Design a protein around this nucleic acid. Sequence first.
RNA 1: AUAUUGGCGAGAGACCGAUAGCGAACAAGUACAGUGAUGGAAAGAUGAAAAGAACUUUGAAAAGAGAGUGAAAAAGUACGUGAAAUUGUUGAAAGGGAAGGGCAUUUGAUCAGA
RNA 2: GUCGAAUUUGGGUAUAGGGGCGAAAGACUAAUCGAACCAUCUAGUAGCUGGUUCCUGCCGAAGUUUCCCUCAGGAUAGCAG
RNA 3: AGAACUGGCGAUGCGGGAUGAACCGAACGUAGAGUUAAGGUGCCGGAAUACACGCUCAUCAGACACCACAAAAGGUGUUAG
RNA 4: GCCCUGAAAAUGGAUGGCGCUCAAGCGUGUUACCUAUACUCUACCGUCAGGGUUGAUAUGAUGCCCUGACGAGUAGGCAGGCGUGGAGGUCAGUGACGAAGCCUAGACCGUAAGGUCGGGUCGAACGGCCUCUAGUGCAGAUCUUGGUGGUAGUAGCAAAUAUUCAAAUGAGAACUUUGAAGACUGAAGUGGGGAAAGGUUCCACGUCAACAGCAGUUGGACGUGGGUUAGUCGAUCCUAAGA
RNA 5: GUGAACAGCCUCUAGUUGAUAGAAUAAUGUAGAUAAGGGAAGUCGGCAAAAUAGAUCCGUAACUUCGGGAUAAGGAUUGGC
RNA 6: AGAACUGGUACGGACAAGGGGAAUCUGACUGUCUAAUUAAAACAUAGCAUUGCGAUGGUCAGAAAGUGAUGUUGACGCAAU
RNA 7: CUAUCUAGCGAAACCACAGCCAAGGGAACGGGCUUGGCAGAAUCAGCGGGGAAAGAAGACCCUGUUGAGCUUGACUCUAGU
RNA 8: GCGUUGGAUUGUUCACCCACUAAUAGGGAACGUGAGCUGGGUUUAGACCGUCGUGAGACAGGUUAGUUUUACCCUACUGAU
RNA 9: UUGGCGGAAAGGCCUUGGGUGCUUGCUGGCGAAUUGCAAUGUCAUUUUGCGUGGGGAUAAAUCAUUUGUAUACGACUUAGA
Lengths: 154, 386
Amino acid sequence: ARYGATSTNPAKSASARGSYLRVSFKNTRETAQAINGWELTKAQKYLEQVLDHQRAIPFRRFNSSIGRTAQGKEFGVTKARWPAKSVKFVQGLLQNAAANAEAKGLDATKLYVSHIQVNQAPKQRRRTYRAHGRINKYESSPSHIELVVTEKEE
Amino acid sequence: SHRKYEAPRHGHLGFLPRKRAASIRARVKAFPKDDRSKPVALTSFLGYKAGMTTIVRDLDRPGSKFHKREVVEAVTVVDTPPVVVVGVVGYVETPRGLRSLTTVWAEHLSDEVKRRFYKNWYKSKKKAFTKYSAKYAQDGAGIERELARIKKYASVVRVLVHTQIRKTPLAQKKAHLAEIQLNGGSISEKVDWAREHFEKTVAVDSVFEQNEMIDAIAVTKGHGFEGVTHRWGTKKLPRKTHRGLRKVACIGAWHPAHVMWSVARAGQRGYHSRTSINHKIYRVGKGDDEANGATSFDRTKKTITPMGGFVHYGEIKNDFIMVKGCIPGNRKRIVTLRKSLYTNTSRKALEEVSLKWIDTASKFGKGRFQTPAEKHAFMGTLKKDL
RNA sequence: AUAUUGGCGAGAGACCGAUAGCGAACAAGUACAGUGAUGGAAAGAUGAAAAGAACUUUGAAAAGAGAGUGAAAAAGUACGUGAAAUUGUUGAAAGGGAAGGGCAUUUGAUCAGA
RNA sequence: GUCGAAUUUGGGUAUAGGGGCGAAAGACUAAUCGAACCAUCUAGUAGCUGGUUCCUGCCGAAGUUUCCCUCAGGAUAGCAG
RNA sequence: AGAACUGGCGAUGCGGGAUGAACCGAACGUAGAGUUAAGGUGCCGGAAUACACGCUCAUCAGACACCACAAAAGGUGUUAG
RNA sequence: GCCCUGAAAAUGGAUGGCGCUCAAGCGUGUUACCUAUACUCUACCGUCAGGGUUGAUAUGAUGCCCUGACGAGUAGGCAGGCGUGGAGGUCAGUGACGAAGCCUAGACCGUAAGGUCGGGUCGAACGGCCUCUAGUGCAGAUCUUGGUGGUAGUAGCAAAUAUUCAAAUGAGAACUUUGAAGACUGAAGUGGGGAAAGGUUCCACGUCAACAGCAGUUGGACGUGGGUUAGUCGAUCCUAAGA
RNA sequence: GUGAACAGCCUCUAGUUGAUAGAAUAAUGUAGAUAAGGGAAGUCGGCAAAAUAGAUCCGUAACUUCGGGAUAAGGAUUGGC
RNA sequence: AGAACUGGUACGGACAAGGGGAAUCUGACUGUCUAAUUAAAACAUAGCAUUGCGAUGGUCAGAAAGUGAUGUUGACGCAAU
RNA sequence: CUAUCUAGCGAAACCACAGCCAAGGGAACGGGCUUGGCAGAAUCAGCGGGGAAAGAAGACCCUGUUGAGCUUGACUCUAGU
RNA sequence: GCGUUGGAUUGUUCACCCACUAAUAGGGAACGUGAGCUGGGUUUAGACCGUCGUGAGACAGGUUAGUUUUACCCUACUGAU
RNA sequence: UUGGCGGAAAGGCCUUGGGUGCUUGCUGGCGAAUUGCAAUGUCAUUUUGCGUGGGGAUAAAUCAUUUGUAUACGACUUAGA
Ligand SMILES: [K+]
Ligand SMILES: [Mg+2]
Ligand SMILES: [Mg+2]
Ligand SMILES: [Mg+2]
Ligand SMILES: [Mg+2]
Ligand SMILES: [Mg+2]
Ligand SMILES: [Mg+2]
Ligand SMILES: [Mg+2]
Ligand SMILES: [Mg+2]
Ligand SMILES: [Mg+2]
Ligand SMILES: [Mg+2]
Ligand SMILES: [Mg+2]
Ligand SMILES: [Mg+2]
Ligand SMILES: [Mg+2]
Ligand SMILES: [Mg+2]
Ligand SMILES: [Mg+2]
Ligand SMILES: [Mg+2]
Ligand SMILES: [Mg+2]
Ligand SMILES: [Mg+2]
Ligand SMILES: [Mg+2]
Ligand SMILES: [Mg+2]
Ligand SMILES: [Mg+2]
Ligand SMILES: [Mg+2]
Ligand SMILES: [Mg+2]
Ligand SMILES: [Mg+2]
Ligand SMILES: [Mg+2]
Ligand SMILES: [Mg+2]
Ligand SMILES: [Mg+2]
Ligand SMILES: [Mg+2]
Ligand SMILES: [Mg+2]
Ligand SMILES: [Mg+2]
Ligand SMILES: [Mg+2]
Ligand SMILES: [Mg+2]
Ligand SMILES: [Mg+2]
Ligand SMILES: [Mg+2]
Ligand SMILES: [Mg+2]
Ligand SMILES: [Mg+2]
Ligand SMILES: [Mg+2]
Ligand SMILES: [Mg+2]
Ligand SMILES: [Mg+2]
Ligand SMILES: [Mg+2]
Ligand SMILES: [Mg+2]
Ligand SMILES: [Mg+2]
Ligand SMILES: [Mg+2]
Ligand SMILES: [Mg+2]
Ligand SMILES: [Mg+2]
Ligand SMILES: [Mg+2]
Ligand SMILES: [Mg+2]
Ligand SMILES: [Mg+2]
Ligand SMILES: [Mg+2]
Ligand SMILES: [Mg+2]
Ligand SMILES: [Mg+2]
Ligand SMILES: [Mg+2]
Ligand SMILES: [Mg+2]
Ligand SMILES: [Mg+2]
Ligand SMILES: [Mg+2]
Ligand SMILES: [Mg+2]
Ligand SMILES: [Mg+2]
Ligand SMILES: [Mg+2]
Ligand SMILES: [Mg+2]
Ligand SMILES: [Mg+2]
Ligand SMILES: [Mg+2]
Ligand SMILES: [Mg+2]
Ligand SMILES: [Mg+2]
Ligand SMILES: [Mg+2]
Ligand SMILES: [Mg+2]
Ligand SMILES: [Mg+2]
Ligand SMILES: [Mg+2]
Ligand SMILES: [Mg+2]
Ligand SMILES: [Mg+2]
Ligand SMILES: [Mg+2]
Ligand SMILES: [Mg+2]
Ligand SMILES: [Mg+2]
Ligand SMILES: [Mg+2]
Ligand SMILES: [Mg+2]
Ligand SMILES: [Mg+2]
Ligand SMILES: [Mg+2]
Ligand SMILES: [Mg+2]
Ligand SMILES: [Mg+2]
Ligand SMILES: [Mg+2]
Ligand SMILES: [Mg+2]
Ligand SMILES: [Mg+2]
Ligand SMILES: [Mg+2]
Ligand SMILES: [Mg+2]
């Protein structure tokens, strides 16, 4: 427990999280922001379409020199990608949160992603060998991902 | 210190920037000066570049070493089916330039030109001009009011015309719509001409004639990103050059501490708007005229289409303009042929050319025969037939 | 009677308090490097007590969500507290080739005194 | 370039630091050579470079004199507290 | 580049010289009001598109010291002797 | 006198700019006006100086009060203070009903060093005053150690011809296994053994958190075990340069 | 097998099919090639590249230490049956 | 080795595989070195010449030795150029 | 084959703060200051003008009462003889 | 405004000559331009010569050989959203 | 409400007729206070939202697929009920 700052009704919410997930923190932040605030079913369909390369995750912060695509137009960007690994981890957490909501007895048709946050987990360190007998870091940037889906009320 | 050996700069700074044109149809940026005594006529025409061929003609140039001798000349064939008049725009002069006061459209617009107003035609409900065409309900009071405004104002009158791509072999199926300035006097008479020609076709012979100097306005062939060596014609660097030789060695002095606009850089080549002038019309041929490619010296009953068809274009089935030499743009591209902006009397213009022979051999190879009949005559009987 | 940075046994300190104090508070002259002589670290703290999370549920699983233990899980062995750099989310605000600052007031937010 | 002899090469063995070894380049002597590496003397010395950690209050300079193996330093008088 | 005297800058902000270590003015605790310095008062820009007598028309006009340059020689240009 | 000729340099550019022609130019004269941390007056802070007041309810004569002047500052000197670890004394000081620490565009005091309070967090100690003492205050030293960024999801993961289809396994297969096909090493091998070296890597079963710069169900990985059989092959023995 | 050949090229036995992949085919590169006419005018300099090349037959200069130079140079031929 | 026949006159058909000549400077040649910027004309070399020395010796080691190298040697030798 | 775009993976150099110019003045060549020109989010591939770009307490030069390699009837010594 | 060249010798700037030409003007831009090249010269270390020096060595004398690193950032520029 | 003029950015100018209200052109009647001696003492117009009525109209674009007149990626240009 002790998620990030949330503003929703805990009795109408269900939470899921995954820690120390070996997936790019930057790609997963973009993936999470892509579905932040979306209805749950809409977000799940969108992530499956991203996996199928029908729609893309707009890359808004970690996007320097990535590349341009026509699939960013629907989000008003030129830079978008298809981070399949990040999408898969987020889908796993979305499915877990949906299962927790159904265990809580929440209306699955009113669920939207009310909170989703990715922050950096401790780096997993490897080594890379460079010219003239030098050694540099070759670290992973894993992710803590948390999300909560809530019943949309008035 | 100074350059140490003088040489002209590479390229023309007046054709900058070497960027892609904003449209595939190059704009006519100037029409002929209006002479209000002549009858009302289009100042330009729309066509599609079909391809190139070669002609033979006697040169009429006294004093030349080839006077009265036969010369072989390259010619460009522009497929020019009649354009459909669908509108008229009135232009008022203002201290800020010309400004379109209003546009009056024809009552019925064919699907050819209606497709121009859609990005997804097949799935649209095709509502374009449906409410406008009701302005012709009983007496066309609104239409006549707008035309009266164009007469009361609008020191410049341009008709809206569109090509008939369905008559070309092109797969495009979406017509090209352009404003053509009406020269010939009496702004009232210009508007009357436009209204009477609404929904009607204007043929290329009503605009252009034999021997006339015309200008070709088109977007050149695209070549994508290009290095300086072929984009600007800069000298190739020596074979010994580290880091590559298709470059400009010095892209600038220390000061100004900036690369300057006048230095050759790699970038887009081609797909530029060009307006090339003084191309002489050699033929104004007609699509209905079989023996289009025949002359008074040849008499071989053949059309302008080469054996096997114009490569990457197809067959010429419409009226066509054959101009001397070459024009900007590649085959299948829409081109605008406009009348010359000045009166050229130079003995190069004013020359009356008479074609003696037009080459209709295949351009798909080293074509040896002008006609299938000639191929049959030379080769005799073959195994499959003939 | 004198010496004694070694050995053994003791008693102490206005000494240091885990980057300090011996290199070493810990399986430290250890791991590890070097052919070799030699060189030589890092590394203490859950909780009074493991009471170290039975059981249910989602997941292939790691795990999650509950439940539970506990004074506390804002103590879950990646464990006391848990700063800064740096980061996510949320909220607020501003933003024509930096940003930040001084004087003054407007506006918004916030607040003490009487 | 050379490729059947002043050839190439394994292993054993010898030569050790002002020493070796050198068909000689100051070359090589464990990525170290116009004197290897390791530890200690050693926190070597430095007129030279860099840094030198709280606040406020009051006073407030000198780059000049003489001497110096002195001229990027000091002593001395002067200026200052 | 080297001396003499003084004043400065260094060690010093402030107003002015657009800008600037040294020039001009003036040296500084925190504020208020008044008046000024040097410098300015078309607009930027606070402050007279003030008043007065003349001079100048430049197809490179001129426009405040330090200071950011111009000479000899010439001109029925124009002015006054 | 003013103006003009004399009067040529390199990015586009400077009476500061705009612009100005009976000037907004030049010479000269007269007024008004603008504004410096300067001058005048006033308050307040401090410093220095000269004084008054131990005659009582008088505990602050280092006090209180009166009067006048003054205030730039590097190097530097001196003074009065602020803060830290520890020590003697004291407040019979604070504290599990919450010490210390930490966070807090919340409040108060001080010119300032700093001090005090509230709120959150937290869990076992700590502080005021009088003195003592020092390993006592950091922005720098290409400072030391540790940690972390932007660069940046970027450079790149391109030598050694080359992969493909299907099935099986599996949660998951470009990469595992089997089959099929296409290729290569081409016997101076990408084959079969050894010497030095390594030391269990060999083999089986289980198995994927880390490692195999993609992946992974596979592995020279991880976990657990199994395995090296000599009178004849070596060492052992001999001597070689040498020790 | 070709071939003078332990060359190069292809194959049998054996082994491997391991090098992160997929998609596109811009510039500039790296590696590999070609080019009309000219033929070193390029450049410090023919750097790079090209040309030549095996074998059989013919023919082979100056010079020479009489050994060479020498594959000098310069010609011709080559398959299959 | 020869002959006939044969073909888009191809034929060492891929692979493989000298460019050549006329001269100058320089080192005779083969060989060697600056491992990691210099391969050379540098070093070495055979040849030539000089020098010392008959052992109680020449040249050279070792702190010293009842100690060593040349030397299992002897001037056609060893040592130094 | 790269570069390019995508999935996965994922560094480094460098970094006072940063990043548009002209002129001025200025430590006499400004990204910042002054005066002007101007100035509109977020960006991709290239590029080599500039960042007096990075790399390294200039190796040239001078200074130091700092060395070291080497040489010689330098000064002072010394093994050996 | 527009152009102001092709070559022989030399690293060369310069010079000089051949030749064409309308003409073969002079200059700047960090004596523009090396993360643009090249590296012939100069300008480490190898080597040769001559002169000088007892010598080590010296020579703005000659000669030969001698590693030319990095952009993916910002801006500028070229193109592209 | 009649009609006319106005396209430079017209979006306004003029004009006909009747209706309604006011009229300070002149003459009366009633009201005002306590906002306490001032406090802008709130009178304008800018956009947006919502609700109540009335009126009106009944699409596209992008992704994906496709073309190659285009193209590094975006972009472009085509096609598809
Ligand atoms: K030395
Ligand atoms: Mg970018
Ligand atoms: Mg890239
Ligand atoms: Mg590497
Ligand atoms: Mg290595
Ligand atoms: Mg020139
Ligand atoms: Mg061309
Ligand atoms: Mg090169
Ligand atoms: Mg053809
Ligand atoms: Mg320690
Ligand atoms: Mg600690
Ligand atoms: Mg070692
Ligand atoms: Mg701890
Ligand atoms: Mg607690
Ligand atoms: Mg903790
Ligand atoms: Mg923080
Ligand atoms: Mg030497
Ligand atoms: Mg010291
Ligand atoms: Mg003073
Ligand atoms: Mg100094
Ligand atoms: Mg000084
Ligand atoms: Mg001063
Ligand atoms: Mg000035
Ligand atoms: Mg004052
Ligand atoms: Mg004013
Ligand atoms: Mg004069
Ligand atoms: Mg003048
Ligand atoms: Mg003025
Ligand atoms: Mg005046
Ligand atoms: Mg006193
Ligand atoms: Mg003071
Ligand atoms: Mg202490
Ligand atoms: Mg507390
Ligand atoms: Mg804060
Ligand atoms: Mg405790
Ligand atoms: Mg200390
Ligand atoms: Mg610090
Ligand atoms: Mg400091
Ligand atoms: Mg540092
Ligand atoms: Mg560090
Ligand atoms: Mg990449
Ligand atoms: Mg690579
Ligand atoms: Mg490969
Ligand atoms: Mg297989
Ligand atoms: Mg092969
Ligand atoms: Mg093979
Ligand atoms: Mg195995
Ligand atoms: Mg991996
Ligand atoms: Mg993996
Ligand atoms: Mg499994
Ligand atoms: Mg194992
Ligand atoms: Mg045996
Ligand atoms: Mg054979
Ligand atoms: Mg050629
Ligand atoms: Mg040829
Ligand atoms: Mg020839
Ligand atoms: Mg030449
Ligand atoms: Mg030349
Ligand atoms: Mg030459
Ligand atoms: Mg060559
Ligand atoms: Mg021959
Ligand atoms: Mg010869
Ligand atoms: Mg030789
Ligand atoms: Mg070398
Ligand atoms: Mg070499
Ligand atoms: Mg020699
Ligand atoms: Mg500038
Ligand atoms: Mg200047
Ligand atoms: Mg700068
Ligand atoms: Mg400015
Ligand atoms: Mg901007
Ligand atoms: Mg580059
Ligand atoms: Mg640059
Ligand atoms: Mg230095
Ligand atoms: Mg140095
Ligand atoms: Mg001295
Ligand atoms: Mg010495
Ligand atoms: Mg230069
Ligand atoms: Mg440069
Ligand atoms: Mg360079
Ligand atoms: Mg250069
Ligand atoms: Mg050279
Ligand atoms: Mg040399
Ligand atoms: Mg001599």
